[PDB]
Amino acid sequence: EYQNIFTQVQVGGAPEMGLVEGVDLSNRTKGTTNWTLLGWFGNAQIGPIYLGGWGTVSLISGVLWFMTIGAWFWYEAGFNPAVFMRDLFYLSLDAPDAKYGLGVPRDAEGIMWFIASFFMFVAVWSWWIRTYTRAAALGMGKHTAWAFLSAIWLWMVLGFIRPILMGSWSEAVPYGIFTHLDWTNNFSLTYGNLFYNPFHGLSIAFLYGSALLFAMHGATILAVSRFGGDRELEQIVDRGTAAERAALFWRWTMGFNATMEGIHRWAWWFGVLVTLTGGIGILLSGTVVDNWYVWAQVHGYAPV
Amino acid sequence: SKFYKIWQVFDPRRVFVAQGVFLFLLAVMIHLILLSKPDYNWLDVGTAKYGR
Amino acid sequence: SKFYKIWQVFDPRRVFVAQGVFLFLLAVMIHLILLSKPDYNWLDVGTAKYGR
Amino acid sequence: SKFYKIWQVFDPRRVFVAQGVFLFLLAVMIHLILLSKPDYNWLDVGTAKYGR
Amino acid sequence: KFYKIWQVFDPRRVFVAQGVFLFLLAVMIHLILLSKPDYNWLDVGTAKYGR
Amino acid sequence: SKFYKIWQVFDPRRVFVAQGVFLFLLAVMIHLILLSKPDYNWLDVGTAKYGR
Amino acid sequence: SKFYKIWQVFDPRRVFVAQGVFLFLLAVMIHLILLSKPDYNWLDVGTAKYGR
Amino acid sequence: MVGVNFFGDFDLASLAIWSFWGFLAFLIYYLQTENMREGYPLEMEDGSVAPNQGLFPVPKPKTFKLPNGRGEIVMPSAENEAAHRRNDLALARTSVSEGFPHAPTGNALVDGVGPASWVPRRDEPELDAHGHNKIMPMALAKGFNVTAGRDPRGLPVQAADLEVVGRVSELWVDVPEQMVRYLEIDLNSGKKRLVPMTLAKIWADRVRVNAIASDSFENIPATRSASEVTKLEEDKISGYVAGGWLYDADKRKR
Amino acid sequence: FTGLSDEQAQELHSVYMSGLWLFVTIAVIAHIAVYIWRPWL
Amino acid sequence: LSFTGLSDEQAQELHSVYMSGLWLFVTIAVIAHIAVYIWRPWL
Amino acid sequence: LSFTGLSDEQAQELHSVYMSGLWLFVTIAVIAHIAVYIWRPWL
Amino acid sequence: LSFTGLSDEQAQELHSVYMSGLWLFVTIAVIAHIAVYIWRPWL
Amino acid sequence: LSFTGLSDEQAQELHSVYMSGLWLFVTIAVIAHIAVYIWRPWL
Amino acid sequence: LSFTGLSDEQAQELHSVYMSGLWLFVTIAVIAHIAVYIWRPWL
Amino acid sequence: ALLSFERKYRVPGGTLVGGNLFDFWVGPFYVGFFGVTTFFFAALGTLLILYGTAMEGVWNPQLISIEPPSVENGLAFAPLAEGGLWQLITICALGAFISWALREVEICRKLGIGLHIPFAFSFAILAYAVLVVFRPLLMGSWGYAFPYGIWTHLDWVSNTGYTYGNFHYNPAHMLGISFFFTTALALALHGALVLSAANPEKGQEMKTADHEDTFFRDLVGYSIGTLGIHRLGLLLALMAVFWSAVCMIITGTIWFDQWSNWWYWWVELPWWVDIPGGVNG
Ligand SMILES: CCCCCCCCCCCCCCCCCC(=O)OC[C@H](COP(=O)([O-])OCC(O)COP(=O)([O-])OC[C@@H](COC(=O)CCCCCCCCCCCCCCCCC)OC(=O)CCCCCCCCCCCCCCCCC)OC(=O)CCCCCCCCCCCCCCCCC
Ligand code: BCL
Ligand SMILES: COC(C)(C)C/C=C/C(C)=C/C=C/C(C)=C/C=C/C(C)=C/C=C/C=C(C)/C=C\C=C(\C)CC/C=C(\C)CCC=C(C)C
Ligand SMILES: COC(C)(C)C/C=C/C(C)=C/C=C/C(C)=C/C=C/C(C)=C/C=C\C=C(C)\C=C\C=C(/C)CC/C=C(\C)CCC=C(C)C
Ligand SMILES: COC(C)(C)C\C=C/C(C)=C/C=C/C(C)=C/C=C/C(C)=C/C=C/C=C(C)/C=C/C=C(\C)CC/C=C(\C)CCC=C(C)C
């Protein structure tokens, strides 16, 4: 009747600084912290981070990005702090005017957008390389980078590629909290009803499937945590009744099952296919299809 | 002067890469600033100069 | 005159950095309120004084 | 005045870093405030001053 | 015997709480004054001095 | 009469802070409701007492 | 002249990755930029020159 | 590339969606084959090998090279399944037909069947990267102190029949993870026995174990070492305890 | 429940009540002061 | 002690200094208030 | 004693040189405010 | 006492070099604000 | 002496090299800014 | 002296080959930029 | 039909209702009382979908659509050809889902594992019900629910969302979105991490939990732990669906206008309203 959601008893010790497997220890920090508010739901150690080159690139570029957008927010607000904290959500570093096409915008808002985007480019790619390297230094696999690359694919398709194919940086997303929502709506409305973008439907299928799957996996692993199912790496190699019971639950339930490694394989795909299908479905919007409801009618999933 | 003591408090690696990033990004930023201006845009300038 | 004692209560490092952030933000906020108001914008007032 | 003991209070490397970012961000804030105002824009003004 | 509070509460906590609270209060009162055309000191000053 | 042990019942520390928060909040809300009513707004009454 | 000590700081197998990446990014940026300009777009200007 | 049909109504969009169907087919193949590394070949109730071995074929063996010189593990393999194979099973067929249960012949909590089943993991303990044991009692774990929560040590252990059996003595911890896995009991019978923390609910005045009743706390498998615990002993213990949610329910009260 | 108030429960409560008194006298003076100036009932 | 374990006398000293600070603060505030009522009264 | 762990002397020396600093800040502030009052009178 | 552990004399030389760079930066900024005042004033 | 652990010799020569590079850089920067002002004055 | 496990002999060889390649790349880039100036000048 | 370890678990017991009656397996599947119920309900709903599209004359699986009664029908039962089919299919679907959950329960207690999974599923049933049962009742009519067509419940979504302008401005919707995105994110990260440990670079030994914790501490300065990430993703999904149910039950019952007008309470606060600056001045 203990469901293992919140940890009852906390323990700790000298911080677990790390594992030296080819990591540069000098680029690592040495200060840790304990914060029990988390210990209740997870580890409490806000442990040492790695301060590297790619990380510095990312931090610098992305902070310039952030503060650039904040600068334009101020200018757009009359420098009145109360306007800033009033219209904070309604403000925007809107995207260049279509007149400029793909040329360097000849306005302030536009070039600020362009520069902030350059910074984001640098930051994201630096962080991807940082994932690759941190997994190469500890001697692990690069699955995390190839998953992130999926996210990068969508993000690029939206900021860089799709517009280049359409010939306008106007197509790209504004940097605001409500304006990028408005952008999504206007994108759907301009191009038919995006629902009828089969790849949109697939990305949705995989988002819902990711939630489905993580609830399944998590509830299972907490159910078999009384047999140490939380320790998975050791149930792939030294199988125990945790894995057997989980597999047999799902077998007796739906007729098929997985293994303590293959469920992880299933997760890595439902995740990345959310942004692989999205990128394609966004590329094809306006370059291959100016309206999706009619494509549906013609293709048979929508009625005449 | 005793500026040469800074390398007793800073490590060459972090500082070098930070300075590289900072300078390159600054160059790009200022170049784009200029090209946004119908004036100082060397492309458009040399365009009008040679009458093309 | 017993005020020197506080540092027996606080760690002056934390006090000092929090003090610094406080002061800087206050400055930028006060200066900004002033820039925002059309009067007290030393820049617009100047440009009107020298008629630029 | 014996302010030097602040270096006995907190460390040089971190204060140096913060100082650098603070100064650069401030310099940029101010240069941008200027560019935003029509006058004080070193570029458009020079364009007025020299024709073009 | 109001000196007995220091045994119940920690001065480190009281200073970091009272300070933030008082700052907030001052900022709020000032802002309420500013929101009123009257009591907006910057506004009043500009008119009185003719600027 | 016999109210001495309200403390044996309640840990003194939490109770005092909660009391404080509650009182401050209640005052703020009543003042707000008064300022909300044009008739009951003290600042506006001053605007009548002095012509300003 | 003693620049050769940079390679006593940076392990070159990462520096070379970074450098090649940077250079390709830059080449693409400038090529594209020029392609965004009817005056410097070599394909279109050649089309017009030869008259095709 | 708008309105450009290669043939019929087929454009880049159609080609892409169809290519995706194909890739997806291959992907379901891949995943449902990689979910075969454990459990196959399919058996009957007789222990034989059956004709229906699935429509997806078992894949080609890979290899896991373990840390701390524990060797090479090959999945799928005969060694892998035969090690983790249970024998001398106290079970009786309920029917000659297949698809019907198999009753426990004796005491199941002991006979290791049903929810109380265990698996022959290897009687070598679980290790960290450094090769030190993962689970240490909090007293050997240098530096380990309770950083929060209710320190259970010394609290009585109420059981499913509401009766009391002993007092907690020590906490067994996951040092690399910094969390409490097992708790130990100083039982009335003069014995020490472990019980998983996930099966024990720390109250303010006690520790409640609604899984099993009191008769069972004594027949719990023990540890050949009082400073370490192997994966095998862990599975035995955990199965025994968890089986009480079914096999000691006639005793559970409240 | 605190187990530290067995003796000073009296002290704690009494001083708390004294504070309460100061606060309430100030409050009543304030209420009288406002009522004449603007009367609310 | 029961809670903080603050030494008495020192706690009384803490009360004294704290009170001095409070008095200082309130005085500055009232002076400012009086300054204002004369410049722009409210009552 | 001292929650910080600071010496009694240490406390006096820190507050003193700290006060020199707070004071420098205040004096520059006064100079500036006064200067502005001439150029623009806010009241 | 010395949380950082910097010695008194190491600290003194640190502050010396620090303030050298500081005054350099400050007088350069002064040069700059002067030149600005000359081409375009702002007060 | 040093948070980094380096010596005065190593730091001296490191600084010499870094500053030679800095001077080369600043040199080219001034050259170019001058050629520009001549090309299109911005002041 | 060395944080990267290299010695002067190694590093001097390395800078030699690196600068060879760099001069070659700069050479072809210069040639190209000159041909383009002839073709379409940007100044 | 059995795995090499499926036998010692095929024991009797763990049944909420029934007993020996229905304690057996059909192929891999366990069928208790509730297995029989879910099969019956599912099959019936399926056949009724097919008859509904047969009456219509539609046979394309994408254009097949069984729609709810008109809104004017109100909450009464309608003719099978005008809503009765949708209603029976809804009944059968709900019975099927609840029975699936209870089957999961029976199995969880036969295999001696916790009941986290049926709990998780309960939230999804709750949301489906919010859509087809509760929200209507509170809105007065079955016809406000969604249809059983692959590409038509999308039209219901669109029209229902454009009734209140851009539904994006519903805050509970915002939270649903955010938790869904974070769920996919954490899922990918977990899978990638584990696979990267188990399947490392060539010529290297398998890794352990310590390497995972260290890699993510290196990356972002915090690691949640092997148990904490499961806890987390579970809670993320649940709160998402919680917020998603909350977003819909308040859409046409407590709210009635465009959702944008909600955030204008922050603008319209008296001390920054009149200010002339920004977007709202
Ligand atoms: C008419 C047409 C009809 C239909 C045609 C259909 C034909 C079907 C053919 C069969 C295809 C099946 C593919 C699935 C098999 C993968 C199985 C698996 O999970 O692991 C396998 C297994 C994983 O190994 P492991 O168990 O992790 O351990 C290996 C190591 O020990 C330790 O690992 P490690 O750390 O060394 O490396 C880990 C990595 C092992 O793999 C690798 O190391 C290499 C992985 C590929 C990385 C990229 C290659 C390098 C160049 C990339 C160029 C990018 C340009 C952008 C800028 C540069 C960025 C770097 O593990 C993986 O999981 C690899 C799979 C990754 C797939 C790609 C995911 C990211 C893509 C995101 C989208 C971005 C592109 C846009 C797509 C849309 C375009 C329109 O790897 C293999 O079996 C070999 C690798 C396969 C190479 C890639 C080929 C498949 C890519 C398909 C992508 C989807 C395309 C879209 C579909 C079509 C839509 C229209
Ligand atoms: C009303 C408007 C249209 C609509 C318009 C669009 C548009 C337009 C898009 C989709 C897209 C998506 N929509 Mg929608 N969408 C609609 C209807 C729906 C419905 C529904 C139930 O009706 C659902 C459930 C969905 C579902 C989805 C997702 C499946 C998909 C995006 C997934 C994702 O991860 O995005 C978010 C993922 C990313 C952007 C990844 C970005 C990662 C990078 C690396 C971020 C950088 C980090 C940065 C530096 C910040 C730093 C933070 C600090 C360090 C903390 N939409 C309606 C009908 N939707 C997307 C898609 O794929 O299109 C097909 C898309 O672009
Ligand atoms: C908002 O207006 C509407 C319209 C809603 C009308 C009002 C409605 C309602 C419901 C109003 C409710 C008002 C209430 C509940 C008011 C209650 C007020 C009380 C009970 C105030 C009591 C104050 C008491 C004080 C401040 C007592 C002490 C003060 C101190 C500073 C504590 C000092 C104590 C020490 C030092 C403890 C000694 C410690 C030791 C160890 C000996
Ligand atoms: C408190 O105030 C201060 C000023 C102190 C700080 C405040 C800061 C604030 C308020 C910051 C706010 C930031 C916000 C609101 C950011 C929001 C961002 C959002 C919502 C972004 C959403 C989507 C963005 C996308 C998809 C952008 C993609 C961009 C790219 C892929 C860039 C690709 C490259 C481009 C466009 C061209 C440049 C390329 C090259 C090679 C130079
Ligand atoms: C206008 O309408 C609204 C509703 C907006 C507001 C109207 C009325 C309201 C809500 C009014 C609220 C008023 C309140 C709650 C005022 C409270 C004021 C207090 C309690 C002020 C206290 C100030 C205390 C100060 C400044 C204390 C300073 C103390 C020191 C500097 C001493 C530090 C050094 C020490 C203790 C030495 C260290 C000691 C040892 C032993 C090492």
From TrEMBL, chain A:
Top-level division of the source organism's lineage: Bacteria
Binding site for Fe(2+): H217, E232, H264
GO biological process: photosynthetic electron transport in photosystem II
Gene Ontology CC entries for this record: plasma membrane light-harvesting complex; plasma membrane-derived chromatophore membrane
Membrane-protein topology: Multi-pass membrane protein
Principal localisation: membrane
Binding annotation for bacteriopheophytin a: W127, F148
Keyword Repeat listed: no
GO molecular function, one term: metal ion binding
Coiled-coil blocks: none
Keywords from the named record: Bacteriochlorophyll, Chlorophyll, Chromophore, Electron transport, Iron, Magnesium, Membrane, Metal-binding, Photosynthesis, Reaction center, Transmembrane, Transmembrane helix, Transport
Annotated compartments: Cellular chromatophore membrane
Annotated TM spans: 49-75, 111-133, 145-165, 199-224, 266-289
NCBIfam families: pufM
Subunit field text: Reaction center is composed of four bacteriochlorophylls, two bacteriopheophytins, two ubiquinones, one iron, and highly hydrophobic polypeptide chains.
Family named by the database record: Belongs to the reaction center PufL/M/PsbA/D family.
Function description: The reaction center is a membrane-bound complex that mediates the initial photochemical event in the electron transfer process of photosynthesis.
Protein name as it appears in the record: Reaction center protein M chain
Protein species of origin: Fuscovulum blasticum DSM 2131
TrEMBL record, chain E:
GO MF entries: bacteriochlorophyll binding; metal ion binding
Subcellular location per the Swiss-Prot or TrEMBL entry: Cell inner membrane
Annotated residues for binding of bacteriochlorophyll a 1: W41
Protein family according to the UniProt entry: Belongs to the antenna complex alpha subunit family.
Record's bilayer topology term: Single-pass type II membrane protein
Boundaries of every Antenna complex alpha/beta subunit domain copy: 3-42
Listed name of the protein: Antenna pigment protein alpha chain
Any Gene Ontology biological process: photosynthesis, light reaction
Organism lineage string: Bacteria, Pseudomonadati, Pseudomonadota, Alphaproteobacteria, Rhodobacterales
Residue positions binding bacteriochlorophyll a 2: H30, W41
Location of this fragment in the whole protein: 3 to 53 of 62
Record note on quaternary structure: The core complex is formed by different alpha and beta chains, binding bacteriochlorophyll molecules, and arranged most probably in tetrameric structures disposed around the reaction center. The non-pigmented gamma chains may constitute additional components.
Keyword match Lipoprotein: no
Keywords from the named record: Antenna complex, Bacteriochlorophyll, Cell inner membrane, Cell membrane, Chlorophyll, Chromophore, Light-harvesting polypeptide, Magnesium, Membrane, Metal-binding, Transmembrane, Transmembrane helix
Biological role stated in the UniProt entry: Antenna complexes are light-harvesting systems, which transfer the excitation energy to the reaction centers.
Main location: membrane
GO CC field: plasma membrane; plasma membrane light-harvesting complex
Membrane-spanning ranges: 14-33
TrEMBL record, chain H:
Domain Photosynthetic reaction centre H subunit N-terminal: 5-139
Gene Ontology cellular component annotations, sorted alphabetically: plasma membrane light-harvesting complex
Membrane-crossing residue ranges in chain numbering: 12-31
One Pfam family named in its UniProt record: PRC
Lineage, highest ranks first: Bacteria, Pseudomonadati, Pseudomonadota, Alphaproteobacteria, Rhodobacterales
Signal peptide (UniProt feature, chain positions): none
The name this protein goes by in its record: Photosynthetic reaction center subunit H
Start and end residues of each PRC-barrel domain: 148-214
Any one of the GO BP annotations: photosynthesis, light reaction
Entry keyword set: Membrane, Transmembrane, Transmembrane helix
UniProtKB/TrEMBL annotation, chains J, K, L, M, N:
Membrane topology note: Single-pass type II membrane protein
Function description: Antenna complexes are light-harvesting systems, which transfer the excitation energy to the reaction centers.
This protein's name: Antenna pigment protein beta chain
Residues that bind a bacteriochlorophyll: H15, H33
Entry keyword Mitochondrion: no
Quaternary structure, from the entry: The core complex is formed by different alpha and beta chains, binding bacteriochlorophyll molecules, and arranged most probably in tetrameric structures disposed around the reaction center. The non-pigmented gamma chains may constitute additional components.
TM region(s), chain numbering: 17-39
Primary location: membrane
Domain of life: Bacteria
Source organism phylogeny: Bacteria, Pseudomonadati, Pseudomonadota, Alphaproteobacteria, Rhodobacterales
GO process terms (BP): photosynthesis, light reaction
InterPro entries tied to this protein: Antenna_a/b (IPR000066), Antenna_beta_CS (IPR023623), Antenna_beta_dom_sf (IPR023624), LHB-1/5 (IPR002362), Light-harvesting_complex (IPR035889)
PROSITE patterns in UniProt: ANTENNA_COMP_BETA
One Pfam family per UniProt: LHC
Localization terms from the record: Cell inner membrane
GO MF, any single term: metal ion binding
Keyword Membrane attached: yes
Gene3D superfamilies: 1.20.5.250
Record family assignment: Belongs to the antenna complex beta subunit family.
GO cellular component: plasma membrane; plasma membrane light-harvesting complex
Domain (Antenna complex alpha/beta subunit): residue spans on this chain: 8-43
Alphabetic keyword roster: Antenna complex, Bacteriochlorophyll, Cell inner membrane, Cell membrane, Chlorophyll, Chromophore, Light-harvesting polypeptide, Magnesium, Membrane, Metal-binding, Transmembrane, Transmembrane helix
